[PDB]
Structures are given as structure tokens and as C-alpha cells.
């Protein structure tokens with residue numbers, strides 16, 4: 001087989017890139033290790049930045065989102081028995097965020113891809129990348145036992161943190177920056193109405209808690225738990241009891257509980273690689289960087305990498321300006337580092353760290369008191385939360 | 395002897411409090427361990443907040459300052475070979491800071507006190523505090539061998555970090571928060587013209603550097619040095635060479651060097667005690683808290699403690715409202731913690747820490763890039779730098 005752009009991975013990144021590309025007349029093939037069902041089983045993200053919402057519209061896949069997505073103009077932060085609302089819309093100069101689950105976005109993209117008839121090979125086993133610096137790179141994979149070869153001009157690694165693409169770049173050409181946090185997030189999805197019309201991030205002495213949502217009748221809650229925890233040790237009831245213990249009394253009082261549709265523990269980590277490309281290979285999304293969940297930046301940074309890669313590829317194909325692709329990493333990294341700083345900051349002010357001295361606890365509290373009580377402080381959170389602007393290019 | 399308010403310490407705090415008090419008709423006696431000459435030999439502070447400038451005017455000791463003080467509308471931060479100016483005046487809504495040395499302020503207050511004829515006992519040896527919870531506390535000291543007793547209604551501990559007042563409060567009644575930094579500031583005072591009309595804080599790979607001033611012909615420079623350093627190991631020439639290596643080329647190029655008038659190493663530390671009072675004893679200034687030099691908050695927080703203590707004492711004496719004094723600590727601590735957070739933040743983004751991993755260095759750089767490039771970010775620095783408002787009281 002032959003194509004123009006080979007895409008490794010059919011998660012949000014790969015699908016969004018493939019859709020934008022297909023629409024502009026640039027053929028592309030997506031190779032995915034798993035089955036459609038497996039991919040669709042991942043809950044993950046719930047909050048989308050306006051930039052992501054616009055990219056979905058550009059890809060022509062925004063019908064269901066415009067109908068079912070919930071637009072939020074603010075978020076709350078609870079600490080020391082007090083709730084403080086950050087008016088995102090007012091403080092950011094009018095931007096908002098949209099709550100629409102990653103499962104839904106992924107479903108929307110998959111349906112859109114099927115209808116247009118673009119190529120997607122699921123269960124593509126043992127993908128290998130070859131001749132990354134040649135003028136003609138290629139991908140080999142196994143489909144039901146037979147090893148097939150796919151020739152292409154460029155390869156976009158949209159295979160997530162454990163993908164093959166980042167591993168295919170000579171380790172010496174890469175610089176890695178990583179921080180592992182001593183805790184994880186225990187999440188629970190339930191078919192119960194959310195306790196509030198807006199999200200509530202809570203810093204409590206017992207640990208972090210977050211009240212989120214997926215729709216008017218589906219909620220997503222999270223509690224900070226140490227890394228030693230096994231999800232089998234958390235019955236639905238133990239979780240609700242713990243959640244309630246971490247929320248302000250008036251919030252825990254009106255919480256509608258129910259059986260879990262899904263429960264899982266996500267460990268927190270920060271990770272960035274520089275550069276994000278090697279030869280004809282370009283990394284995007286979780287393949288190039290991981291941000292802790294706090295602040296909802298992961299899927300949102302993937303979207304900007306994608307927006308940037310798509311536009312550079314368009315220039316290369318439509319305008320014969322292939323030299324612009326050398327700028328990919330420089331452009332992406334500027335936004336990646338600022339979002340990493342934001343997620344890192346949010347995580348550090350909202351969670352309870354293990355070996356914390358009295359001075360640090362007081363500074364943590366004061367950070368909250370300052371940023372939440374100052375108009376300039378509220379504005380730094382707000383502009384960061386809605387998402388910093390995308391870089392123009394050229 | 396008998397007085398109304400006994401003040402331990404004749405540094406800025408004690409003198410300013412005594413002056414405000416004397417002027418309002420509240421007798422007070424100041425006891426100081428050292429000689430006037432010794433106190434006057436301490437260089438220290440150079441930057442004053444507007445609140446401090448106003449307090450000096452209220453105390454009627456602002457003639458020389460209004461004449462010789464330099465008003466600054468901005469400060470610069472240099473990092474990664476780029477200088478960025480923070481327009482304090484524009485970004486804070488019109489406030490500025492005033493550069494007038496602590497030595498001068500102290501000299502102005504001492505002269506003002508002498509002229510009014512208020513009591514000041516220098517070389518008051520081995521001061522001890524007694525009956526702090528009684529209705530009649532007293533202070534004993536030694537003057538040329540004889541142990542004398544001073545009776546008073548209240549005692550204000552303005553004796554700095556190593557003073558006797560904080561040590562006189564039963565250790566169990568106090569909560570201490572402290573952070574010691576793994577570096578100090580090597581400062582050099584010279585009769586040379588400053589390299590710039592505004593201060594320049596510089597983050598450089600070799601360590602922190604700061605270009606300050608005292609007048610049109612007197613400069614004050616600082617460089618970060620490890621705690622193992624002895625000032626005798628730093629010749630004037632070694633210092634200038636090191637300073638120049640840390641500044642942007644265009645700044646080091648026009649630097650006028652010269653012999654040191656004073657050289658010394660100040661170790662960095664954060665320290666706060668809660669509460670700041672015990673019975674008839676009230677702590678103010680360095681006796682109650684220490685902030686690292688970064689941000690110029692030390693002498694400025696002492697001024698607000700003083701402003702607060704003076705006004706509460708006025709209420710107690712003039713209005714017979716002695717119960718209001720129980721609010722001293724609560725009022726002071728609100729401002730102290732926010733200033734501590736600011737000094738801590740400045741210190742952490744401008745200095746080079748010893749065991750720093752790649753992720754942290756990049757976050758440090760990104761913190762600078764974000765706050766210095768965002769209007770909301772610049773505003774958080776600016777409003778903090780000029781000094782947060784004083785709490786009203788009652």
C-alpha cells in the first residue's frame with residue numbers, strides 16, 4: 001500500500017489529524033494496535049478549550065458536540081471551607097470551556113472517518129517504522145499473520161505515551177524532562193446528576209477531590225489517592241464516603257450517589273521531549289508529552305500539535321514549502337511548556353503532598369488565598385484555564 | 395523609671411514606633427543593646443514601599459527623604475540574555491517604590507527622636523522582660539553595672555531576629571514556620587554611579603545577581619553565593635569579575651567599578667511565628683518574621699506591623715479600647731503571609747538551586763517567560779512589588 005501521510009494511532013490525535021488532512025485532499029492511513037471497542041472504552045477527558053472546539057468545527061465534526069456539549073463560564077475552587085468562583089468568561093475576555101467527553105469526540109471522529117471512506121487498519125500488530133531520514137520512509141505491520149508494508153512521505157506518531165513512534169527516534173537525539181508525582185487520581189463515572197452546574201476543584205486536608213460531569217445525567221468524580229492503592233480496594237460506597245468527606249458540607253449534602261459505570265486510577269506525571277520530530281517522523285499528543293490531569297490540558301495540547309502539523313503539511317503539499325516542517329517542534333514546544341507550567345502549578349496548589357513541612361503548607365494555602373482574591377491573580381488562572389492562544393506560524 | 399510603652403530595640407521598627415507614639419502623646423522609652431554608631435553601620439535595605447514613605451511623613455520625618463530619595467516607576471528582570479521591564483506604575487494603578495537607604499532612614503529617625511527629647515538608653519545590657527501577663531509588666535536592664543527596672547503598661551519587641559523578646563514568650567504558645575535557603579547574598583557598596591536608572595534582577599546560570607543603588611553616586615550590588623563562602627575570599631576584583639559574568643553583555647559593558655565601602659554576606663531565610671503577641675508583649679518587624687531580601691519586603695513589613703501596633707495603642711490610650719489589641723496578630727499575619735509568599739516566589743524564580751533536575755530548570759524558565767510576557771502575570775508581580783494595601787482595622 002502507499003499513502004501520503006501514515007498516522008500511527010487512532011485515538012483523538014490521530015483521528016483529528018486524519019480528518020483535517022482528508023478534507024484538504026491529503027491522503028492518509030491510520031494504523032491502530034487495538035480494536036475500535038477498546039479505544040472507545042477509555043473515559044479520560046471531559047473539558048475542551050475553545051481552540052479544540054474550533055478545530056472540531058473545521059474538521060466538520062461538531063454536530064453532536066454543538067448539541068450535547070455543555071458550555072461553562074466558570075469553575076470553583078474550594079479550600080479551607082470556602083468556595084471561590086473564577087469567572088472564566090469575564091476574566092479571560094470572553095472565552096469559555098466546553099464539557100464534552102473524550103469518548104464522544106472519539107466516536108464522532110470515527111463515524112466521520114468511516115463515512116468519508118478513509119483507510120483505518122485496526123489490530124495492526126507490531127508496527128515498525130523504517131528509513132526515517134530517507135526520502136521514502138515506510139511502516140511495516142502485521143494483519144492476521146502477514147507482514148505488510150505501507151509506503152508514505154511522512155509519518156505522524158499519534159500513538160500515546162507507550163507508542164512505538166517516540167521509541168523509534170535514536171535516544172541520543174532526544175532530551176527528556178519528567179516529573180512523577182507521589183499520587184494518583186481515583187475516578188468514578190456514574191449515571192447520576194452532577195452536584196453542581198460548574199466543576200469544583202477542592203483542596204482538603206485528606207487530599208484532592210474534583211466534581212466533574214459529562215452531561216445533565218452523568219457525573220465524573222475524582223479523589224487523590226496514594227500510589228500504593230489498588231482499585232479493587234475501593235468499593236463504590238467507600239469512594240462516596242471519601243468524596244463526601246473532602247467536599248464542603250453544603251455540597252456533600254446535596255450529592256446524589258449511585259453505582260459506578262467505571263472506576264480507575266490514573267497516576268500523575270509531567271513529561272516533555274525535545275525535539276518532537278526526527279526526519280520524516282513528527283510526534284503529536286501524548287506521544288510527545290504528558291501533563292497531569294489538573295487543568296484539563298492533555299487533549300487540548302494534542303489539538304494544538306495537530307493544528308500545527310496539519311497546517312505545516314498543507315503548506316508542504318499545496319504550496320511546495322516542505323522546509324517549513326522543520327519549525328514544527330519550535331512552534332509546539334512554546335505552547336507545551338506554558339501549559340505544563342500551568343498544570344504543574346494547579347497540581348501543586350490543590351493536592352496534599354506526603355513529606356510537607358509547616359512552612360510549605362502555609363505557602364500552599366497563601367498561594368490559593370492570593371490568586372483567588374486578586375483580580376490580577378484570578379486573571380492568570382482564567383487565561384490559562386481557557387487555553388493560551390495558538391501560534392500563527394511562518 | 396516608669397513609662398507607658400517600653401520599646402526593645404532602636405533599629406527602624408523601634409524608632410518609627412517610638413516617633414509615632416511620642417507625637418500622639420504616648421510616652422515611650424527605647425532600650426538598645428548596641429551603640430548608635432553600631433546601629434548606623436548596618437547597610438541593609440534600599441527599597442521602600444509607598445506605605446512606608448507615608449508612615450515616615452506621618453511621623454514627620456520625611457524632609458531628607460523627599461529631597462534625597464529616588465522614586466522608581468519600574469524594575470527590570472534579566473534572564474536568558476533578555477531584559478524585561480515591569481512598569482510598576484502603569485501595572486499597579488499608579489504606585490511606585492522609593493530608593494532611600496535604611497541607614498538614612500535610621501539616621502533621620504534618631505535625629506528626630508533626639509530633638510523631641512524622648513528617652514533612648516543605648517548600651518542597655520542584658521534586657522529581661524517580666525510579668526508579661528500581669529497588669530504591670532516591667533523590664534530590667536544593666537547600665538554601667540547597675541541593674542535598673544523600668545515599669546510600663548506595654549512592651550513592644552522591636553529587637554530583630556536575635557532579640558530577647560521572642561525568646562521571652564513560653565515556647566509552647568508559639569508556632570514557628572521556617573525555611574532556610576542553601577545560599578546567601580554577597581553584597582558590595584561602592585561610591586560609583588549605578589549601571590542603570592532602575593534595578594536589574596538577573597537570573598543567570600552561574601547564580602543570581604542584582605544591580606541596585608543608594609543615590610546618583612552610590613551603588614549596591616549583590617551576587618548569590620553558596621553558604622560555604624567567607625567574605626575574606628572575595629576581593630573587590632573577584633566580585634566585579636563575577637558580577638560582570640552574570641549580567642547581560644550590554645550592561646556589563648557600561649558598569650563603572652570601584653573599591654568597596656562595605657562587603658558582607660547575608661544568608662537567606664523565611665521565618666514566621668504565630669501569634670505575634672503574648673500578654674502585654676507585642677512583636678514587630680524582624681522579631682516576628684524574616685523574609686529573604688528578594689522583593690524588598692523586610693523593612694516594609696516592619697512598617698505595617700508598626701502602623702498597626704501604633705493605631706491599636708492609640709485606640710487603647712485615647713479611647714479606652716484596650717480590647718482591640720487582641721486583634722494585633724490576626725491583622726498583621728494576613729499581610730505577612732502574602733509578602734512571604736511573594737518573597738518566596740521571587741527567590742525561587744531568580745536563584746539557581748543546587749540539586750535541580752532538568753524538569754525544574756525548565757519550569758523556572760517558563761515561570762519567568764509566562765509572568766513577564768502576560769499582562770495579568772506582570773500585574774501580579776507589580777501589585778506585589780509596590781506592596782499590598784494595609785488593613786484598615788476594627
Ligand SMILES: Cc1cc2nc3c(=O)[nH]c(=O)nc-3n(C[C@H](O)[C@H](O)[C@H](O)COP(=O)(O)OP(=O)(O)OC[C@H]3O[C@@H](n4cnc5c(N)ncnc54)[C@H](O)[C@@H]3O)c2cc1C
Pocket residue numbers: 008009010011012013014031032033034039044045046047048102124127158159160161162163164185187266284285286287293295296297298299300301302
Ligand atoms: C484521568 C484523565 C483525565 C484527563 N482529563 C483531561 C481533560 O479533561 N481535558 C484534556 O485536555 N485532557 C485531559 N486528559 C488527557 C487526554 O485524555 C490525553 O492527552 C489524550 O488521550 C491524548 O490523545 P492521543 O491521541 O494523543 O493519545 P491516546 O488517547 O493515548 O491514543 C493513542 C492511540 O495510539 C494507539 N497505539 C498505541 N501504541 C500503538 C502502536 N504501537 N501501534 C499502533 N497504535 C498504537 C493506542 O492504542 C491509542 O488508541 C486526561 C487524561 C486522563 C488519564
Ligand SMILES: Cc1cc2nc3c(=O)[nH]c(=O)nc-3n(C[C@H](O)[C@H](O)[C@H](O)COP(=O)(O)OP(=O)(O)OC[C@H]3O[C@@H](n4cnc5c(N)ncnc54)[C@H](O)[C@@H]3O)c2cc1C
Pocket residue numbers: 402403404405406407408425426427428433438439440441442496518521552553554555556557558579581660678679680681687689690691692693694695696
Ligand atoms: C541584605 C539585606 C537587604 C535587605 N533589603 C531590604 C530592602 O531593600 N527593603 C526592605 O523592605 N527590606 C530589606 N531588608 C530587610 C530589613 O533590613 C529588615 O527587615 C529591618 O532591618 C528590620 O528592622 P527591625 O527594626 O525590625 O530590626 P533590626 O534592624 O534588626 O533592629 C533590631 C534592633 O534591636 C536591637 N537589639 C537586639 N537585641 C536586643 C536586646 N536584647 N536588647 C536590646 N536591643 C536589642 C538590635 O541591636 C537592633 O538595633 C534587607 C535585609 C538585608 C539583610
